[PDB]
């Protein structure tokens, strides 16, 4: 009835129309057990402050069933742990670079001061050296993530294995009816694509200016992953951590995915679907129900046609199903009037640009006063004809916005919540309601990592009127 | 608005008795509060879950000297948290490793009587063991396990046998509550004993009107201290005394929000700074430590003696979640004559039900399962002060509603389901009772020395579509 059974974005511009597209290959290895990221432990709690330490470091990981792979990871050989943050708490972080080149810690999703706490290009930690930052957190319940933002080297470092999941909990809008037992009924899905060259990742080998694609899907750094379900309800926190690849998530048994959340948090109401497309950097939290299944059944989840995660059903321990409310979260959406900001995304490959300009680190491209609600007009000037086009996902640092309209029409069924990343189809005009809460220099860019690297970034000053600020910007790219 | 008084009639409180024993705050180090381990499942196959529980002997360091000789379930003393879920089948194995006969009464669980009931008819001999099956179909609530032989229940409870039982129903559970067992969700199993050379001797302390100890335990811990690491704390309080009433207070009159009673949640939450509990009663309360500083102690006391100290540490999370105004929907509209009468009478030796002592081979009442019948439990002890005692009526295999007390509305926290109810002298408490499973169930005074003496009786919960012949024997 009201069940989606399709993929929302315009198909004529999907990634697989590209001339140098790489199809995924289901690799020949044993079914590995799905790796769950460990929960990051606190060094200490002192007042409302919580002390964390995170090392960027090199290591070997047995991913295939042969040699190991040379990986980069946070507090480990590859990927990183679950980092919990709580709304209304102060956090002290220690960023230790144990890698042999400069990196940053961009907290994609966290609304914290820019451009240092933010973790964008401006804040660099040198090999050997480390960095300290403080910040308060004040935002809704949502799933975020951590990745490197060094310029122009992000893509390479993400490819090298740097990324981590970030859970943010707000006591005043959290839904404790949902599965929350991390590792058991509440799981991340960090989808990425890589190509192994003798059980080894070589970014230089696979590079494409329009975005680098791998031929082998990973999931939490696991290949041919299998997760055993021991409870009826499963909460998946899906994240497209690819450089370029779109994630068209489906199943052969068309199991209903009820989506409770997006990049910015819970949605007004739940949305039932059997498919879901995710562009880069976009998260979705979905519930699955295994009640009407028998023990031993496999529910294979596929990206397009290739299997990436298998959900095997065991004997259930308890029944973790709890009736939800109809409204998951209250959200004002009544906003009108002309756009005060315009972002024309244009080009492909070499040509990629924003408002005709490439990233310059010493330039402020826009300004907006914190607190106010201003409307944006993000557009894509790619050819609409099928295969002519391309889907760029706009990301904005230090904020969560609302999608107001797409070419005048209502946004897709699952976009009535807060987001920080949004797919723009060719020829489209997406209207966004943006509000900055903390001031500072923030980024906005295409989250296809090879585009950002090649200069699809721009900077905005979130202005506090009661604290005009002088900036000493340098370019380190 | 805020209740600040104990509910029951004071003229009949335990401390009017001629041979009352005052509690003594003992001189020992502040011990860390013991949290019962969660019982592991042997296996799961289908909707069935397999448990095994040993009754067994052991030594426990309770004081800071010698150890004490204790009895316990899967351990030296007390027992673990036993989780049950509504809408599941359970297979249990009861292994008696004690040197005398015991049972496994699941006080609170609505399961068939009188075998799976764990009542007197279900003895397990020393060395031998027993198997039982049963489905669970009841609301979210806290129950407990204790032995119920004839007439040795009191001695065996005193010896250390008891355990907390959590029962969860997915369709009426409130996941807003603290549920992280051991962290923000803990039991409070209040008991009183007297140590004779760091040793329990029931024969020494015995009083037919109920045995009293001079030393409060809490989860078998003396001078317990629990460190709070989260703003909201869920206490599951249980009076596991033989006789002693539990007048729970605090010197700093912290507000206790009472979410639940013996049969589970209340229609709405009730705020109070005090709460009285008679034997076998349970109450789940929330405390809020937001407006406190680190290092503060919130001492809970039974009467004038401290039993637990809640030290405030650095908080890890904020676990406070808005509750709804109605915690649970409950029909209370029920009228018409009582079809059942229980006259509780006597004290000490005289104690009796409807003029009769417990006889194990006799059916004292009958009631058809499914139907809602009204009961009239009364106390004919003198109303005049110091001349009366409060007997708590318990009924096996059912959860009832308190409809009225001497015609008046029941106390502020009695609008939910209970299985135990205090009856003041001269009182007439009207109860709405329904049996869901048939069999031979007990109803009795849960002052354990009264039950042993015989303040007990038996009812046949009759299934009309399965009349049964009973071969009842006295296993006393
Ligand atoms: Cu990002
Ligand atoms: Cu970002
Ligand atoms: Cu792009
Ligand atoms: Cu960025
Ligand atoms: Cu009992
Ligand atoms: Cu009972
Ligand atoms: Cu009595
Ligand atoms: Cu009983």
Author numbering:
A (entry chain A): 1 to 477
B (entry chain B): 2 to 477
Quote the study that presented this structure, word for word.
In this study, we report the discovery and characterization of a new psychrophilic laccase, a multicopper oxidase (MCO), from the bacterium Oenococcus oeni. Laccases (benzenediol:oxygen oxidoreductase, p-diphenol oxidase EC 1.10.3.2) are blue multicopper oxidases (MCO), copper-containing enzymes that catalyse the oxidation of a substrate reducing molecular oxygen to water. Biochemical characterization of the psychrophilic laccase revealed its optimal activity at low temperatures, with a peak at 10 °C. To our knowledge, this is the lowest optimum temperature described so far for laccases. The structure of LcOe 229 showed the three specific structural features observed in the LAB laccases.
We obtained two types of crystals for LcOe 229, one for the enzyme without Histag and the other for the enzyme with Histag, that were grown under two different conditions and which diffracted X-rays to 3 and 3.5 Å, respectively, each one having a different monoclinic space group. Crystallization of LcOe 229 was achieved by mixing 0.3 µL of a solution containing 13 mg/mL of protein and 50 µM of CuCl2 with 0.2 µL of the same screening solutions. Crystals were grown in a condition containing 18% PEG 10000, 20% glycerol, 100 mM Tris-HCl pH 8.5, and 100 mM NaCl. Crystals were harvested and frozen directly as this condition also serves as cryoprotectant, then, they diffracted X-rays to 3 Å. For LcOe 229, the Ramachandran plot showed 93.7% residues in favoured regions, 6.21% in allowed regions, and 0.21% of outliers. The asymmetric unit of each crystal contained two molecules, which exploited two packing interfaces; however, according to the PISA server, both interfaces were the result of crystal packing. A comparison of the two molecules in the asymmetric unit of each crystal indicated that they were identical, even between both crystal types (RMSD between molecules was 0.2 Å for 476 residues), demonstrating absence of conformational changes between them. Interestingly, in both crystals of LcOe 229, we just could trace the C-terminal end until residue C477, which was forming a disulphide bond with residue C151 of Domain 1. There was no electron density for the last eleven residues, an indication of disorder and flexibility. The structure of LcOe 229 showed the T1Cu site with a Cu2+ ion coordinated by two His (H451 and H392), one Cys (C446), and one Met (M456).
